[PDB]
Amino acid sequence: MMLGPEGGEGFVVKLRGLPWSCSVEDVQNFLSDCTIHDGAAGVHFIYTREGRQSGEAFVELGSEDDVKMALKKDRESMGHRYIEVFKSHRTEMDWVLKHSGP
């Protein structure tokens, strides 16, 4: 809560493998290396589309060198659970989130 509402131009990273109950405080802890385009006003979680979260997410980083900092970890773990990090863009992310609804 320093920049927003959203719009990290293209520095999205997709996040896959993650715990079924995790949140941005864990994105920011897994990437204590890293900025994000605000801190939390670039993170989103994915949702099975009807009434639950999933082990998947997407995060507008605070530069593409933040994206690269997240790629350093691209098959690590945080929890008893894996954290694959794909390099993404807002143009994909706006599709993949916005399909649990209108």
Swiss-Prot record:
* Effect of mutating residue 84 to A: Loss of RNA-binding
Entry's localization field: Nucleus, Nucleoplasm
| Residues modified to N-acetylmethionine | 1-2
Q: Which domain of life is it from?
A: Eukaryota
Q: Where would I find the Glycyl lysine isopeptide (Lys-Gly) (interchain with G-Cter in SUMO) crosslink on this chain? A: 72
Residues of the region (Interaction with RNA) are 81-86
Q: How is it modified after translation?
A: Sumoylated.
Q: Where is this cross-link: Glycyl lysine isopeptide (Lys-Gly) (interchain with G-Cter in SUMO2)?
A: 87
Tissues/organs with expression = Expressed ubiquitously.
Enumerate the spans annotated as RRM domain: 13-85
- Positions marked as site (Interaction with RNA): 16, 20, 52, 75
This molecule's function is given as:
Component of the heterogeneous nuclear ribonucleoprotein (hnRNP) complexes which provide the substrate for the processing events that pre-mRNAs undergo before becoming functional, translatable mRNAs in the cytoplasm. Plays a role in the regulation of alternative splicing events. Binds G-rich sequences in pre-mRNAs and keeps target RNA in an unfolded state.
Subunit and partners: Identified in the spliceosome C complex. Interacts with AGO1, AGO2, TBP and TXNL4/DIM1.
Domain comment, in the record's words?
Answer: The N-terminal RRM domains are responsible for recognizing the G-tract of BCL-X RNA.
Protein name in UniProt: Heterogeneous nuclear ribonucleoprotein F
